[PDB]
Design an enzyme around this catalytic site. Structure first.
Site, PDB file in Angstrom:
ATOM      1  N   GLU A   1       0.789  -1.239   0.000  1.00 37.44           N
ATOM      2  CA  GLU A   1       0.000   0.000   0.000  1.00 37.44           C
ATOM      3  C   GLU A   1       0.823   1.293   0.000  1.00 37.44           C
ATOM      4  O   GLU A   1       0.250   2.427   0.111  1.00 37.44           O
ATOM      5  CB  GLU A   1      -0.993  -0.035   1.182  1.00 37.44           C
TER       6      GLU A   1
ATOM      7  N   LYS B   1     -15.774  -2.656   0.389  1.00 36.94           N
ATOM      8  CA  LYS B   1     -14.931  -3.241  -0.660  1.00 36.94           C
ATOM      9  C   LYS B   1     -15.813  -3.707  -1.834  1.00 36.94           C
ATOM     10  O   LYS B   1     -16.520  -4.721  -1.739  1.00 36.94           O
ATOM     11  CB  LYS B   1     -14.068  -4.354  -0.092  1.00 36.94           C
TER      12      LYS B   1
HETATM   13 MG   LIG Z   1      -8.680  -4.332   7.470  1.00 39.20          MG
END
Ligand SMILES: [Mg+2]
Ligand SMILES: [Mg+2]
Ligand SMILES: [Mg+2]
Ligand SMILES: [Mg+2]
EC number: 4.2.1.11
Lengths: 428, 430, 428, 430
Positions: free
Chosen positions: B203, B341
């Protein structure tokens, strides 16, 4: 007319390192649209314009460059036919009026240059690679994939900066990409099994604490094999020595990066060493093996290894045709790294590529350390059938975006696509 | 008619980790175009379809899912009006016919779902955020920016997985982004000065070998201050504890020894809540994701009773973008926020239903990236489209993360004086 | 461009009570068209502008407001892209320059706001609900249908102003509408059989001379059953107490409407009474149960009944986000009546709805007493998936036009449409 | 071609009384659109089709008629040029194949007829009134506005059904509308001051418990004067006697006891004429609808002989928008005006033929609403399209009525200096 540019607009955005860059949007009267993002970027190369306002982004803002686009370049270019790429590029060059593009900013200029081309492709409803290169575009580039880093890019005792894999033996770009991905992942497994670090650097590769160059190289060879590929058939190696970073007087001083006891080589000895490496390992390309100013060293290196190893000038040439012309004349190098933003316009970029081809040099289109989601260089490599690309490791979308665009271009070309592999090394 | 979908085409591409994913391209008769790229993706969430061919990409190929798009879904969706997003999403859901989207692949489905929406926005000649959310789109999200990693994402003795900064005090998204960038860069300097590693994880954040949690937290506070910002005014902290990774099911304990070494605490649910409260009282923490285990329902309620008024409590594994789980959480008073998500549910329609269910309960909906990302920035547009008010899309390096921030800059720019960055006021749950 | 607004034109027209209002027509360069009609409409709400010329329509003309549209707003908004709803709304707010929209008139402003949105939907060739709310529009609202009237709306001894039926148990809006129609018609039959009046009031419902509240409520329950529906399963009841009309010191004085011997209740006793009613009858919603300024009373009411009864602020909130924000903070009410013309722009309307949702409050989109043939509120309710609507009884096209539009929207949504019934009460 | 009808679609909707009706939507290949809503509708008039399913809407559903549109008429009309109104109307008439339109339903037929015309006007990009009537459309109708009701529409001892005001003296339709509105409002005040009921009936007027006809009439005169208008100059009165409702067939008498109580008059046809004459001499009455019974042909002639020179005499039930009845009336010298109900005949073509037959005989054609109305305002456009000069579309409350007046305001506005409101000069029959 519908092809007439009606708007040119820039804004400040961020690069893959979280530093500012800019992008430009071009619109035609018909509503065709192009966006050009600029990657991060000597006394004889194009200068990017940074703000120097240390209250913002440590002085690295691009608002002045953006203002140059919106308040100077826009008014000059609005009214041109979107398809007049060369005239537009030349207009910008004259408007800046300095060799290094330092008044407007090479970043301002290039952003417009790219956005215009993309708007023109959009206008004509054809892919960018076709717009840029005409009908005979078909060669998918052999990628040099930066997997391990040393030198300034590591704390490991390794002088060279980039270690690359080149999946030359794949039948297609799609396959070549898979080879690289699988090798990268195998390498990561190997690194973990040795307790070595697998976090990545700016280009998506690893900078592990190897014992030395041979360790690093052998670890790569180990990953190639573990992934089921044959070094020296399926996959070759490439270095970016960036030898300018350890050149000082008249010597390549390895102690800078490889510790107190490292070799200090004369230019003759540096050539000797590169030859040793080349003879020991399946190395097909060496970038910046000699220093940016070691012209005699470059010629000698090229005399000794140029027949069966690609010798790429990066800092040696800085995408500068005056430097490339001299190298061609002197027998220095046999390849050039092409950085769009080091020159600053598509027109000059393509002139460099063509100058290189005509001399029997390969033109290797390249990413920068600070990248964006733009994939224009992919289209450039195919547009010119350049045959090779240097756009990073197998992680980070700043790199993977280019590989993905190459997959699309290959897909779109269908049976016309050609991945030439080793045959792209027409310089050898 | 010109808005009719004429082709739906998928191909295999790569994600930010160099693993296969897929994208889909949709065309209408008029020539409008959309591309939908899908990020990397328990027993009650959408399942991505992988090939399992150990000869390619370590079994991670997506050619089966791509084949499902090209040979099954295309056939079914070609002929719809491109603007009929819900009907198309529902058609795909019925065509798969399984709760988890495991026949076609959630990846196959979501790629089409996104590509259709993008093709529709292209057809109508409006921005995606306007297409998705209608006219009243204006809220730029407050970003939770993952700066330091622990737990399964580090070899440092730190149990929690993500440590984030939230530039709540900025006046605009553009400023908020700068605050993050400058803090990230100041942190990197600090790490170098201490001989700590500055290479990045998935990330774009760091996973340095800190001596413990407090060291990591205090180092972030130091970076914030070195960048000239005030913790607890300009910038707050967020955690992703990912507490499921160190929860011992059988002894019903949060066992810190899993990541913090032999001598670390082993906490009961009551003690875990106690610890999270200690941290919250000691540091400017405004959000805690997965502070309790995915199945520790009573623990979630108790946590929420103790800290929910003053701290955002985000279910990630607790909810898995599943409205049946969210509905239960709402009913039992568990959590006050949900990580959204898109690929964990698999369609845009279901994504937006989840966001709306969260809003209506007074929960915030935090649109999230995945570990394996692409150059797509659709989640940016989703955040603005729903005025969700928050986003979780990575650190301040790697274009897989930065592409989303860049899109947010464009959207902000495009909205002009209508744009609103609400900062702390986005925490309507508190 | 083709999406550019080329004309904005208002005229004076009449409302359902025969009083003037206005409408606005917006045209784009492409010929897209929208018409926005405004319904009839505290010191902290939007003010409609009336002429005060008692030689015309008893001073209720709207020609000044119309002149503001044609001679001030038109020139300001012509040139905007029709799709820039928020910018246009904000431009109008700034052009008026007063909190209450009293210079231009909230009626002038809203007419333009609506007409622009309708022109934009027309331009994009999509339904208004999609234009307003984007792709995820699907919830058909549970209607609260005003069937019997009391208080200021009757001469019967009944303090509460509106008595409603809510066909929560229907599977679809189409069915819900039929339930309401059949109950309304059954009720009319019942009223005639008792020699009670069946002529209608402003919202299409009856104001018969019942003996009292219980009589009225029981008569409604009788009609529900006669139509074959089950109170408390298929159909619930709703009140608009409009308690501000019988609040005076510190008491709810029922003698105002229910005669000399009626109760005079303290705020504690008013809560007690509403609770008695709620326990005795299938009441799911109570609007303005406490006075517009009885903040402590509102909080206590909400403490006692808020968990299983919807408590709607109408005069308590006057579609004012400052009032809603305070109610949210204080725990006052759990629902808000949304009157477009009480705030004056679509943008502010949608901001109110979203503020309410985020607090777990329902937003009940509402008609006004003086209505028009416009059905925009139907589209608003679906656009925001609000889940509920308050738009009148089952007679008078000023009401039925909205129900008809809901039938169309349901029809157009096909299998995507959802009528959630009781599940729309997410506040409970 | 672009003017070709590509779809014809009906759905069930509700009228102003909350009873089912239907609407039809027509589309052309070019995307031109029209919606036609149908209002609520003896043995020689068009019959609307109702379902008769006592489980829904008390047997008043229109789903059979809707099904006739969707499954029979659509098939037949798709493929016509949208502008071929007559051919389409005639095609529908032949497809039904019965005089009364009872197979398909007059409602089904008229909905298509209207929707087609509206789609055609949309296609040509002209107003409906121009589409329907060509270039020489200019006359705004003098409205007869139903203010007070009696007979079957009241429980007051008043035999006549409708009492109307006619603002003949206004210079424009816009003014005429204001005159009506102001009188209506002044009346409401008067009613409140007398403790009389102000709730409204189906047409938006009042049905107060007046002591008798003269009380009702004098109360209207009082309202007119209180609004500042002069009865017999600015405003005249009209009646709908609906005399068929109190006519005893068997004893051949107009029996006022039916509505005005035990002691009311029982009039022979000669006496009915005498009474109508008394009223006309006592009050500023300019129009009387159904003054004689629907079958009292000799009575109609005698009435017309006695009052027809000075008073408009409108056949409603006498003619039922039936050109065979109108033709006979013309021939026998019965009545001098006809109430035109579009849905009583069932097509626009037949509607316009009726209007033209009336004009050619020197009869006025008064385009009329029905008790159960919709948000449609087509009758406004019909009135102007034919320069008919009069309209009957309700009181001054309820949008079912006001929508028509609003459309007349638009048409007047759109016509600019060409608009003519002729007032008393619209009574070309007198
Ligand atoms: Mg998480
Ligand atoms: Mg280099
Ligand atoms: Mg109220
Ligand atoms: Mg009649």
């Amino acid at each position: 007319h519908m092809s007439i540019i009606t708007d040119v607009y820039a804004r400040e955005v961020l690069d893959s390192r979280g530093n500012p860059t800019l992008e430009v949007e071009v619109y035609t009267e018909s509503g065709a649209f192009g966006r050009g993002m600029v990657p991060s970027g000597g006394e004889h190369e194009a200068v990017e314009l940074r703000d120097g306002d240390k209250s913002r982004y440590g002085g690295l803002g691009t608002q002045k460059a953006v203002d140059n686009v919106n308040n100077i370049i826009a008014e000059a270019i609005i009214g041109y036919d979107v398809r007049d790429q060369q005239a537009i590029d030349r207009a910008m060059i004259a408007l800046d009026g300095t060799p290094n593009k330092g008044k407007l900013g090479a970043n301002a200029i290039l952003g417009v240059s790219i956005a215009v081309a993309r708007a023109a492709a959009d206008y004509l409803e054809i892919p960018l690679y076709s717009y840029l290169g005409g009908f005979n575009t078909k060669v998918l580039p052999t990628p040099m994939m930066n997997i391990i880093n040393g030198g300034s890019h590591s704390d490991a005792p390794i002088a060279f900066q980039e270690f690359m894999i080149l999946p030359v033996g794949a039948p297609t770009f799609k396959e070549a990409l898979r080879y690289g991905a699988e090798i990268f992942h195998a390498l990561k497994k190997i690194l973990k099994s040795r307790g070595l670090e697998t976090a990545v650097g700016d280009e998506g590769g690893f900078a592990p604490r190897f014992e030395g160059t041979e360790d690093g190289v052998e670890t790569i060879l180990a990953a190639i094999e573990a992934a089921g590929y044959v070094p020296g058939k399926d996959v070759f190696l490439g270095f970016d020595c960036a030898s300018s970073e350890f050149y000082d007087r008249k010597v390549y001083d390895y102690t800078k990066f490889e510790g107190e006891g490292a070799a200090v080589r004369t230019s003759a000895e540096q050539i000797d060493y590169l030859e040793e490496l080349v003879n020991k390992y399946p190395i097909i390309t060496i970038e910046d093996g000699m220093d940016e100013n070691d012209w005699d060293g470059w010629k000698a290196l090229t005399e000794r290894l140029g027949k069966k190893v690609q010798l790429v000038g990066d800092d040696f040439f800085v995408t500068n045709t005056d430097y490339l012309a001299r190298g061609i004349q002197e027998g220095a190098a046999n390849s050039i790294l092409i950085k769009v933003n080091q020159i600053g316009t598509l027109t000059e970029t393509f002139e460099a590529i063509e100058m290189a081809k005509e001399a029997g040099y390969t033109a290797v289109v390249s990413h920068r350390s600070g990248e964006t989601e733009d994939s224009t260089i992919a289209d450039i490599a195919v547009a010119t059938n350049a045959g090779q690309i240097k756009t990073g490791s197998l992680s980070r979308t700043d790199r993977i975006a280019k590989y993905n665009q190459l997959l699309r271009i290959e897909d779109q070309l269908g049976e016309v696509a050609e991945y030439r592999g080793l045959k792209s090394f027409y310089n050898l």
